[PDB]
Write a protein that binds this DNA or RNA. Structure first.
Ligand SMILES: [Mg+2]
Ligand SMILES: [Mg+2]
Ligand code: NA
Length: 316
DNA sequence: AGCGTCCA
DNA sequence: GGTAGACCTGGACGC
DNA sequence: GTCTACC
């Protein structure tokens, strides 16, 4: 298929969004375990599926440049303002990150030192279905392997979009695509391990027991506490996966996912121990306490602060 | 040399 | 509710 | 990281 585009080579096909590097660093956000569907197919150019279409993104110092491959056999053209609005919404650019960074660093000198090096780590606003099933795949696993699982999931069950170079892009699967009684065994052949049952069972649960796709909108509109509790009914979704979905797709900025990294960070960088449990190792109680600790430290956007330290810890 | 343990 | 241990997969890497 | 089984 046609080539992945670069900004310098095809400038007619790109349009810009005002966005300084202090507000966004694509190389620190897109491969850091929020979305698993972006790839740096050319140096400094990131390609992936965003609102049912393939996009490539690249930055200059003050602008985010975007290009869209529409693949309806239409003539190539730069993104329209309406199309760019989807990219603006995905990166939540109405939130001003430099002001959050000032607050987090003011209350936390360790955060301040990390943030000096890791500018522009913000939170994507993801589709709830893509986020739910990607994070069901993430538990007790590593980002490289999760990325391959999500890719093969989309390849097998999501609609084909377009081919660029040797890469065939697919949309994320629907609930209905993942709900069949044959889907689990297929996802096992695709190497999802014991999470194959969780993906298929969770799709069935949403369709058969929760009212379908509208339930995720209910949870978007619900409090953090109510959305967090409700998600945990799903097979494979415990408190960490539920917090990932709350933070990254249901607009709960205070949700703080607590994984192996955040636990290591708490111990190493904060010398933290739980005070609501005599036993100090990970447990339902101590994981709950740690998320409350980070919220008390960083404030209402504590989950966004978590994403900064998580991105940095993947690099260290 | 590559098995087998650690780890995400 | 607290606790312990099993668990798919496959890269890192000590021995 | 979540599940299941046992206290
Ligand atoms: Mg054309
Ligand atoms: Mg559950
Ligand atoms: Na420090």
């Amino acid at each position: 298929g046609p080539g992945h585009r670069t900004l310098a080579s095809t400038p007619a096909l790109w349009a810009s969004i005002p966005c300084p590097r202090s507000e966004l660093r694509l190389d620190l956000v897109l491969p850091s375990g929020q979305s698993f569907r972006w790839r740096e197919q050319s140096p400094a150019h990131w390609s992936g599926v965003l609102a049912d279409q393939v996009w490539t993104l690249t930055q200059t110092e003050e602008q985010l440049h975007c290009t869209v491959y529409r693949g309806d056999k239409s003539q190539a053209s730069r993104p329209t303002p309406d199309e760019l609005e989807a990219v603006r919404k995905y990166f939540q650019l109405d939130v001003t990150l430099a002001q959050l960074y000032h607050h987090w660093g003011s209350v936390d000198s360790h955060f301040q030192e990390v943030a000096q090096k890791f500018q522009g780590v913000r939170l994507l606003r993801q589709d709830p279905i893509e986020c739910l099933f990607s994070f069901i795949c993430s538990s007790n696993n590593n980002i490289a392997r999760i990325t391959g699982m999500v890719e093969r999931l989309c390849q097998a069950f999501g609609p084909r979009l377009i081919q660029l170079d040797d890469v065939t892009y697919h949309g994320f699967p629907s609930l209905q695509a993942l709900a069949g009684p044959e889907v689990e065994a297929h996802l096992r052949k695709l190497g999802l391990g014991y999470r194959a049952r969780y993906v298929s069972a969770s799709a069935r649960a949403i369709l058969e027991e929760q009212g379908g796709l509208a339930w995720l909108q209910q949870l978007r509109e619900s409090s953090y506490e109510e959305a967090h509790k409700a998600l945990c009914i799903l097979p494979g979704v415990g408190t960490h996966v539920a917090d990932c979905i709350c933070l990254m797709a249901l607009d709960k900025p205070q949700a703080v996912p607590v994984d192996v990294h955040m636990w290591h960070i708490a111990q190493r960088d904060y010398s933290w121990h739980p005070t609501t449990s005599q036993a100090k190792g990970p447990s339902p109680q101590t994981n709950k306490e740690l998320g409350n600790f980070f919220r008390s430290l960083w404030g209402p956007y504590a989950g966004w602060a978590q994403a900064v330290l998580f991105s940095a810890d993947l690099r260290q």
